[PDB]
Amino acid sequence: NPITSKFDKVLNASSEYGHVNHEPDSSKEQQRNTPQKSMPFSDQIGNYQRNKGIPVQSYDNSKIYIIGSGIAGMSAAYYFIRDGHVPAKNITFLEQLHIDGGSLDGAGNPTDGYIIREMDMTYENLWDMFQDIPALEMPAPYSVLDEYRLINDNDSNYSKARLINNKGEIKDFSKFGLNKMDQLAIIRLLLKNKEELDDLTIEDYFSESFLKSNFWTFWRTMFAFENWHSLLELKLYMHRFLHAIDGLNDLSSLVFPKYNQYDTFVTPLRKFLQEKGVNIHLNTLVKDLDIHINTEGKVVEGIITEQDGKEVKIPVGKNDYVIVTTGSMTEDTFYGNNKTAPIIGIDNSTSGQSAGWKLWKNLAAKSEIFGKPEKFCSNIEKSAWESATLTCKPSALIDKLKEYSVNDPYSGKTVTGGIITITDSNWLMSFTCNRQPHFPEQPDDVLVLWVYALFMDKEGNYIKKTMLECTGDEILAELCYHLGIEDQLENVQKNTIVRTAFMPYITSMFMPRAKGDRPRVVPEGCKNLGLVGQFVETNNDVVFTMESSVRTARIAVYKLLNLNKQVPDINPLQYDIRHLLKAAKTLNDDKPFVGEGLLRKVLKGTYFEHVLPAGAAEEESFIAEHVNKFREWV
């Protein structure tokens, strides 16, 4: 290796070398400094993790096919280039739909109506990439991270009207409303081993009181969880975003890109990849892979496609690699507009038949290590909801909107601060106005609001139809009803372009799963295939995030090429005592939790007083009882 020549004496005598664990597991690692340890801890994020890849061989004669060009696949290419030193020209995207980007869309225009189908700072893998990706609206040497922080540093995000009911009156959202039994259920969930929860659903575990709580109203709307989704995934979210728990009620835990995610993240990434010399196919349908299995392992040696109307097989040489974004969330989307309801063209009998789902189904046929696609896409009634993009000119809508806004909508600063959930709406309907303009070329008198509902089988309060039955102007009617401007519905409809989208696989990611149902990024025996997206398995990260897309991509690269590089686990902020205690206090609506009073007497006046959370707690009396309550809990 002409890269490592001055180290060959050491590298050859190394036992670590080439046997790297590219995906360390923080949920199993007992962190100790021993003679064995030569690598950082499994979640030791920081600048020390900013070293680059060292390929052990040339990849000049190696081709790379990437099926699907969401962030997940473009991420794989970036790292193959950066860490594998694979020539960019050797990489080919075979795209399914032929607007790149996937679930991150910026479709539409002011005339026809825009159409769209939330992050925090712990998106660690995302920003490992985007800090070296050229900015949209800043000159060199500035990056996407730079402009992201240029606007988020100087305009805090928060809500002042998180919850409304009674035709527009602001509902109180200062408290979670969790009783003791439910606070215990959350805690026991955090303690439960991950492998013990196969196929269990949220409503299987949590009480009715929990499900009626503000906490769950907060969590279910902002994250898009349904009562029948995966218990495990919810648990993972809590571990993942524990530090954030005190800013859920007012969405102060969040930050947002200047524009829509397509224009902010997808375009600059694609543009960057297009500059180094990457190839893109916008007319190749991938239906299956040609995999050869034997005693040794699994090798992809061909890609079965449908170009035009014929079936063309792309050969995959022994030295080539393949990346697959195995599932789709936006597939089979059925749109609608103002005068038009979406005519849904499938039921649970035809669900799972589509370009994207079929490819995974064909993989599963080959070997059981490719997962169980049918568990995710076999119940549209459970994995669907409908979003509506509002293109708005001055209206009674915008009038009422300004009452809910933090800054003036047209100001370019934070507006609604995130979704505004209509508590007493039958659909469980939420809407949001992000920073305007949401689109770079948006007109100065146009606002783009976004709407969303969680119950697909309930008749609205005002419009006595289910949401998928409604026209654009009818959802406005249902919206206007809950905003007390029903009596001005005409002014709104004549000035608001509505484009709806019914997505049957939008929460298929969250469906109850069991062991082996999701493949690993690089399944047993696979020498040259990688699986990335919201449907492959990572150690502890969550899904329905761009972070998982990037996380899975990096794993693919490093594991396939056997690089020296790791992908650290999720940000260890849950282990931070400050966020543990903050969480405990917040779950309890600032009531004194157990041991707090004691903990206050000991730390107040010390170095660690700042560790104590916000609120007020006072202090063998009844210690004999908590002993025997805690003694019985275990």
Added chain:
Amino acid sequence: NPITSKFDKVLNASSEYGHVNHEPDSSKEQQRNTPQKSMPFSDQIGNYQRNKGIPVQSYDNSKIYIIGSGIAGMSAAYYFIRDGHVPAKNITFLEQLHIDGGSLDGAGNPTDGYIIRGGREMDMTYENLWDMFQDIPALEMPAPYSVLDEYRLINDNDSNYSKARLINNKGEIKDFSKFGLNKMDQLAIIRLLLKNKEELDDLTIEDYFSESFLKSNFWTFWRTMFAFENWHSLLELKLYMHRFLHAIDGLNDLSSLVFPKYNQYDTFVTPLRKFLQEKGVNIHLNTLVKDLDIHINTEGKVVEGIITEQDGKEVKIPVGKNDYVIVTTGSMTEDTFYGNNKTAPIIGIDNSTSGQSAGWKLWKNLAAKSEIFGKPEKFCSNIEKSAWESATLTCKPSALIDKLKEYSVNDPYSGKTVTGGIITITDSNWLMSFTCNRQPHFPEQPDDVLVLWVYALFMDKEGNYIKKTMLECTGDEILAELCYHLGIEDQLENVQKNTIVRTAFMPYITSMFMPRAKGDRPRVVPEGCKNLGLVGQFVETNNDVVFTMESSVRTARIAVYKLLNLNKQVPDINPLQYDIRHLLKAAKTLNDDKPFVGEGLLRKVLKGTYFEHVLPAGEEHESFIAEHVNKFREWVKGIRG
């Protein structure tokens, strides 16, 4: 602003723009997610912090003068260029000595002998150092690889650890498996942690810790790998504990460390110099800066000139309305006296005129202008307290190397970890330690030569075999005392003919650890200063410790970011002390890996759960829980007491 153009609407209605806290204090922050928050928490390290500076004006007309070409001065240059967009042309260094680099020296040759005044033990928590060096061209790897890359190429594939941390009785390995802290001495450590930083003014270490503590293997470990003397700052020791709480369990075998492939001049300094020279920064060697010209009026402090001693003459370098000045207000390697095999270092000062060397005069002069520039005399007024000596052994094959090979984790000539760090001769009168890092230690070091490093902590003690104080000894004599404790004193002649020795007496090596009080160290940019920044090991930061390279890079970034009022922050130290996993591990370690109070209770709760791995390494019934609870409540009770 042509950078900001696309954001003017929002920025001109922002409450935060131009009011960033460039040095957030994690020691005071009640971390909460509130409407008021837009920045990350004070110590939220990671990639989100990898954004860049956005200067609000041009600096093409702005000259920047940097006194001191050490890792702190070069760092200020790097960040001025990186985040200030300051033309590298516009930057000039002014150095006192013959060569660039400062305390990270790496001179000498196989014929005269090498000389390293010292080595660099490190951790992965050096966030600012690595925020910089991750973008600095590698020495021994081609483009596009960084110093960070070649650093990890060697350290990822070769663990550092020791199998002979303590030796005594003329060669024998002392058992170094335990800390040996007792009930009371442990608790005294706990309390120090809990004490507010503001209450420890002028307190020394021996002022606070028992004699048992000071004889514990813990303190033997700590005092030798951190160069602490019993008469040093209590606050500093505490700061260290907070800083390196996560490393406490790998101190006894030094498994908590990583080392640069070479001396830090070749590994760190030279790559960075090369980088800055190429962009076009200027340097002036052998130039002594005696004093600054600061104009102080009703509205602030402004540097307006630099008074220099170039050669023998005195020259005054003017400083303009638009110019900036960065000062390294003290060097721990100031006024070194060198010796060798046949010569003891002939000490040209001793207490009577301790502190009247140059380099101190600049800080001394500055302190005369305003109390806000601190009190240098608290640091350079006692050579007997601030000094010790190191020796550099350039070794051909000899009975010394043969003995060394028994202490070595890997064969000395291999290129892997050798001693694993310092080996401390427990019962040496000088309290002498010695190390052998990965060899070669210099890029051009011969195949049959090894470089060994030796230092001692007691300067006023007659040796065990040579009945003199260390600074009285010739290089040959230091070899005698050393050979005695290794058991080779009967082959001293062989060792002497095959080992070149260069010693370095450093009168102010540990001057940074001297006890201090409120105001004794100036802030990086003192109150009123519009164009002066102060960097290095003698200036004030929120929580970081001194005698590290990390602090020098830390202070440099604070300098740039405050002086230019940038959008950029300097996060506090890595928050591993708040990691419940390192908390519990510390407690268990401080108790010789026997169960600490409370652990049993905790183990009843987390064992068999998602959080089992949190429990440290080393089960009674439900009936005894009411006991464990009361004995726990009783323990926290007596903590304050």
